[PDB]
Amino acid sequence: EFFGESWKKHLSGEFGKPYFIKLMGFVAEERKHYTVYPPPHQVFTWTQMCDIKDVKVVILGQDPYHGPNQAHGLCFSVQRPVPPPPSLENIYKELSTDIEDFVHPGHGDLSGWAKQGVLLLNAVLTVRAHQANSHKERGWEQFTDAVVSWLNQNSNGLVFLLWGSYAQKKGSAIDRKRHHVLQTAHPSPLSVYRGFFGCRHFSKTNELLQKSGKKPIDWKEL
Ligand SMILES: O=C(O)c1cccc(CNCCCO/N=C/c2cc(=O)[nH]c(=O)[nH]2)c1
What we know:
The chain has 222 residues and is α/β, with parallel strands linked by helices. Helices cover 32% and strands 11% of the residues. The protein has a single domain (1-222), classed as Uracil-DNA glycosylase-like domain (Uracil-DNA Glycosylase, subunit E, 3-Layer(aba) Sandwich).
């Protein structure tokens, strides 16, 4: 019901593996005793926005937002009327200088990017309310590794945006000739001035996409 068919076709090889069944049991048990984000129907939103064949750009995240109403299955995104968190505000700030006509959309919902084939993938897909990293190393990492590996092996000329050391390690094995990799600091306030501000990843992405024979992302389409 909640897992997009084209993604299911290519990823379902994971589902019967011991780690996956165990993971499913862990999350189900957590939901019985705690509030877990995102809601069940939004754990796999990243599979719902575009066909797997139509992925053009991959932005790798770590943990889902752990505050009420924030996480909805796309890394960095928050649905209306939730205010964009500090990392997202910094993303928008960089966009405002990198993409000339980009102006703050007045909301944090990145669905418009996802629909264009910008994959917004967290490494860990659930979290206990108010407890950052609470579902770390429970099986999600292996599953999302499987996703990244599939894209690496089966797609062509993808642009991977790797922000922060965690994302960079996750993307370390990507074929740098088949795909394009851009790396910089995490857009969090604590690290944003260590490279993210002035990285110009968004304009650069579109240049690389043209070199891959592909039409650019409209970063304003939100
Ligand atoms: O907002 C401010 O004023 C502010 C000030 C100082 C420092 C920071 C911290 N800057 C890193 C923020 C990182 O944000 N994390 C978002 C995230 C969401 C997600 O779904 N997956 C992630 O991996 N990461 C923010």
